[model samples]
Target: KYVKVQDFYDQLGKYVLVAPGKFSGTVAATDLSTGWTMAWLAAWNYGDTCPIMHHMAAFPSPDPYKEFEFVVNTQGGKNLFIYGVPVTVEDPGEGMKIYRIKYDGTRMNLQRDAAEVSGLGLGVHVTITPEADGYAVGDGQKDICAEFDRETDMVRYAWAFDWDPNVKDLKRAWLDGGTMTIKRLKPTLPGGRYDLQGSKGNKIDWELVPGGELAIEDGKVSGDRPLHSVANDALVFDPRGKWAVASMRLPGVCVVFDRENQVPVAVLAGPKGTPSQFQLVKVDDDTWTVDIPEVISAGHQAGFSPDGQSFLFMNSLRQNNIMVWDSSNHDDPTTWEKKAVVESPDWRGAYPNTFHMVFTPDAKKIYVTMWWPSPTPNGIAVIDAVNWEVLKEVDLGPDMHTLAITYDGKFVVGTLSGYQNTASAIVVMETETDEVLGFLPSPMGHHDNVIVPRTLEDLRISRSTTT
Candidate 1:
């Protein structure tokens, strides 16, 4: 099929053809499909072009960047923005524009941009991809164009979201919660390729390396069995060495695993009735030698105490309260002391309610996201685990929903969705300054609700030891 070009018409006007086939100053015709002249289409075109047209026509469609799509309201309406991009469209006469906002996982507060246009900050939907030098910001309008760059793990642009314009950095999270074995690997040499392979057939064969882990084959991974839990909301390893615990829902217990192997070594299943709320499962003599009971069954999160001897976590039943468990004397479950933690009093009001939690990098605080009600009241709660105090009850103004903190506890990114079915962007914030670092449209549209946690370095150590 041949491509068609049209003009801008703000209202629900019909598509008017201003040019034929992709040339400038060509014959303008009416897009017979809709009774409007193609020359009179909205500046926000209904669909996207493989190569951008003479004019900008950005919209908010999930797969807008795909080879095929249509114009009209799709899923999660008009939630698009235009900031944190490297746009140098110098005063191109009344071109459309949008805001780059400050997103703290739950809400978005409009911010200033050097290219800020008076009426252009509508928070357009966006998705970013790793371009050769910088990046590409496709706002449901233009698919590939110049954008900013973070210059870090700038490898394959794996995950893409339509929300959280604040999320600038791309971290890696191997989706498989089960044990992964790297069987064969052809190490990289001068002028050689780094080839690796893996399989789930019979047995796992692989050698471990120290720096990072490698996937023998590249593919999306998930558990082979009925993963006791699919969403491991809070899971991380302490650099100093300790057990890693992944908490779950349904008044559930934390899934204890060996930080070194990522293996499900034990389950800290809480008792049914007045049973121990949460427990500690030992990994080694020093780390996981005993189990301690805490008043937490569904500790939405769990992490190692800076000291590595104690454990800290939270529970939804406890009104989303947090606590620290001293495993120093777990032989007598009673010996586990309770250190008061933070809790949110306003969480109940959030829509589509959520209980996903993540701790700050330094373990000094915990971040909790709860959807108050529908359409609004959806935001996150940052609490100081030290004093169990609410550090901030960020309201990600209209359209903004969902959140995630960086692995190092440096940034928090949230998303905003246009009420209908449009777009999403990530708004990044400096944890220290809480200042809006700027915004970046997620490369994929309408995918703002997925919880993207801070990624841990994929270590090859697992391979070297397992073999």
Candidate 2:
């Protein structure tokens, strides 16, 4: 009966992120202030594994921009300072390229004194055409707007298909092995009633083009599947949401991907120092692979302090210390580093796995879920946030999986293994006394915990990705 949204409170403009690498794509609300599901995309995969949104920045500008300057903080995903994170697609044999295309209906007629004449940008045009592209074939007519760059040769840095397509050309992803079969076309000319007049009595630049046919190859197509990741253990955002910091246990690193790292980058076309599009040529047999310099692998079971000023990383197993980072520069991650760590030499168990971590609203304390005792024992470890001191290890129960704190900073919550519901369920404790407040029943068992956000500040993924 109507469009749907993923969350009951999936506010317009806020992203609804899925934790698991579910086959479905990430969804965003397009209607202002409403959770109507309008755009749900997974981007392009072609020859690679499927994708979901890793994380993304808000649609408008970041930092120096906000609805009201109200200040409340959480670990930011794509905050103000983050820039140039990687947005790459898997290889489809050769490398991707950077270019633009010009198709039929597009222009800008500059007007002076209400008379349209030679304009710079594109001209406004509504072409009446047979249903060919975006619509069904049975649909009689379609109104096509602009295509092709009309501005002063301004080059676009993203993919080729990132540009608009001319429905009449039948050009979609026609890149068969890095080659496109484009149709030869000249600016449409009027045989009987058409002259190069821009406006009724005003002249425009479109008339300057020679009536000769413009020779060009098939238009190229390319894209950036920047949104999802297969899966991640810990994910946090910058103070404003520019890029995302996510952890992977597989590679042992907290990876960051910048939203500004637009796609279809230029690689060698052949075997020269310059890379080729995809992979081909016989000159030196030099193929192309993408260069992602921003990718780093040093990892963790992570959390960011409530003040958004510090970062925490608990290296499970081999590492006996919990790390902290000074995130004072909310914008530039290039300046961030491991500020300090809290050591836990007394932790005893068969396999000590540091599971989840969360910070108090005050940022003065940190709570970490620990699977300490062998096979069936676990607890939540408390640590002094500012001093990096191992406060205490309060044993809760077996499989203490996820952790969280109340918005008022009064209590902490932990969910035991949903599969281990026979043994334990959910536990709550008073923050001031570390006293067990209650054991809540979870018939379905609790695998994870999520506090619905009331504002961006409440969306503290910096609490940890596992939550």
Candidate 3:
């Protein structure tokens, strides 16, 4: 289960997709560790195949990350999709005109993604199967179809009404099955390594401080730094891969990136400094300005609680209100509840500017960081999650920017974001006792930290093992 993927083959186990009767063979590539499965289909059949019909990507559940149990491993790869589940399909291939029915507990779907380019696509109803099994057996109005047997390793597929005549109606293809035999290469697909590092710009391990050449195992991974947007403060993703919000913290706007077109679609702003309205100013086919006004430090960070039930706006602008909104129904806005309004009374410097909120594994409790926690001020604020009340402000060092929690949620490690002059101090607390176990002096300061996985993808296994 903990095999390290040495090269690409190890990370991407090889697979051959062959139509037992028609296709000679098809080599498929996928990074199943991320829970998104991509495969190269039979291309040789059509003399000159369109890229859209070449391959596709699929996942087992609605949100792959949530149900994915074997999520982390020291070796980089983790197990693929869950077995015996209702698997849905989304086309990254621009809807090649095929709808498919998969046997053995798999639910495949099809939709017209091309016309949706103008961002106008049909949202059809899903047909439900009467079977008691947890699976979807309905066909969309007229979706492109493709199928794979999780057992016999067979795939029945068709695309485009022009060439894929058999796939005139995916439901029809489901009835008249049999096209290819698709084999799942490896049980696990690879990912976990700090080595590949940051994506946009920086690469890690670059020297900032001259060498005492720290004699710790500190050379395995590295990071890249950008000066322009120096404080790339916070980033949070939409669990369903629809949209993402990012901010540079200070002196920047919170831009929302549309995953569908891969464009910076809109800006989230608040007029009078509260992100409550959208002032749209259109600029010639290009510049899309989302005008709300940056008064209370709007467009900073949007935090969605890990439990998938609640969320908070990034306006923790180090001042007053921290509004908690509960969206228990996943993606519905009407079902949301306005839970709490916690206050951050000023600590010296007029305000105790709060930074990030760190949650314990169970989310029963959360730790809020204070940037002005020094000489005469505060520390990390602990809050009761369900009730949204402060448990207490644990005493600590100069400044606590972001707190790191072990996967098991036992030790709450606190650090200072001190690039002020030299390094800072680190304080550790045992959650069970809420006792300050000890503090360690650091050679430098750190902004944030998290527990990395070693054996399992959850990145947790410490307590269960023998010491």
Candidate 4:
């Protein structure tokens, strides 16, 4: 059967080709049957007179559904396969055809088309040996590459589409029921360096030394840990700790906690009326009781003082008003009284939506985000926690949405979502100085931002340890 050189090599499964010397090029193989090009590899056409091409090709197809046949062409020259093994087709000249001479258990032969009686240099002679790892135990080359498709535990051959058994260690592991039993591994560590303690300062000097838990702390292992609760005055949610299901709802813009004990204080931003009410949702028990009755159109974002005695809520867009509530008893939400409603001086009309607010850690100030750019300057509106007056506006250039203060109370990070324009940047500034620290370009429509309560390292430690 006469077959194209590329078509023939494509069916050879996994084989290695090595092309050496100066003149080099790239070889691209495309399976004509599937039209899948298996990328390209480095090859060489070492001129015409010397005609020596050494290239290595390794095809590792793990999917059983996909099979490939490649017609590889280096801008110049190549190799042929015999019984699934790639052999160098030494200087066979250009436009030459290959012929399968013979195939059997002991040997395989292939010859390149040549002009007259060109000595024995025109053919390839490979003696099949029983000692070869890739060959059939009784014949030339059985399905030597079949083990790759069936096994996942073995290391794959880097040069071919087959998994080569890790004869030294992995094979031994498989033979012993796949359990790697470490025998007498003495782990060396400096003695008595680290310890963990309880409140009374009771310490356990822990060390993973030669004779310690590292050696024989056996049996099946399981993990258990205490759920981390909000520390005193922790307003932000610790994304690292085990989160509890505490609340619910819709038009439900966002929820704020009782700054002191992390109780859900209010659910803001809904379609007008009672839907936007305050809640006495106990963070500890996850139980809720509706407390406030007054409705505000679209309560965007709300915040509470660190003492949890006072709360501030905003109507971001239509009827833009920033209202305050004072609770006589910090523990009783029903005793909360409407202190005053401070209308936005910048609001005279359309879409002057108040977005988000952040309370100073000390409970002295509130930074509020207003969405409108004209009458209000599209910035954060600062409110006095005591007198409830607009102290000053920190102009943050266009459509400033929600914002959060860093734990230290130094930076105010706000998002500019280009709500009515094209200005999407995360603006960070000094909380006191109002000095623009930097503006990070973000996607054009980010609506809210929060500084995670815990650092990534804190989360890592929180996640890794168990109580």
1-467: candidate 4 lDDT, tens digit per residue: 78554553343233211111112223233222233433333322223332222111112223212331111111112222211224355643431111112112122222221111111111111111111111000000100010011111111110000111122232121111111110111112233111110111111111111011111112111112101000010012212221111111101223333422424454332323333234433323434433223222323344445445555555444456765656435444445556766665567575556555666666677777766643345777787877878777767776565565555666666667553235566666666856666665453333333332232221111111100
Residue 461 shift from truth in candidate 1, angstroms = 20
Q: Give the higher-TM-score candidate: 1 or 4.
A: 1
Superposed on all Cα atoms, the candidates' RMSDs to the truth, in angstroms, are 19.9, 20.8, 21.0, 31.0
What TM-score would every model get versus the actual structure?
A: 0.37, 0.44, 0.43, 0.36
What ranges in model 2 sit over 4 Å off? 1-232, 260-300, 348-350, 373-376, 418-421, 461-467
Instruction: Predict model 1's lDDT versus the native.
Output: 0.30
Candidate 3 Cα RMSD (Å): 21.0
Give the per-residue lDDT digits (tens) of candidate 2, residues 187-272: 22332221212111111111100000010112211112111111123234444444344333212334343424421112111111
Measured with C-alpha atoms, the lDDT of residue 327 in candidate 3 is: 47
Question: Which stretches of model 1 miss by more than 4 angstroms?
Answer: 1-235, 259-319, 323-338, 348-362, 397-411, 415-423, 433-439, 443-467
User: What lDDT would candidate 3 get against the real structure?
Assistant: 0.32
Whole-model Cα lDDT of every candidate shown, in order: 0.30, 0.33, 0.32, 0.32
Q: Please give the range of 10 consecutive residues that has the lowest summed lDDT in model 2.
A: 134-143
Residues 68-151, model 3: lDDT tens digits: 111000000000011122324332122221222221222221221221111111111111111111101101111111112222
Query: Predictions ranked by TM-score, top down?
Result: 2, 3, 1, 4
Better of 2 and 3 by lDDT: 2
The weakest ten consecutive residues by lDDT in model 4 span: 135-144
Per-residue lDDT over 1-467 for candidate 1, one digit per residue giving the tens place of the 0 to 100 score:
76332221121122211111111111122222243332222222322211111111111122211211111111111111121223343322221122222222222233332013111111112222111122112111111111222232121111111111121211212121122111111223333211111111101121111100122112211222211111222233332332434443322344444433433444444323333333333343323322322222233334454334445554443244545555454233334444454544553321223333444546566555553323454456666756668777665533444344543456655554333233434555556755554444432222122111111221111000000
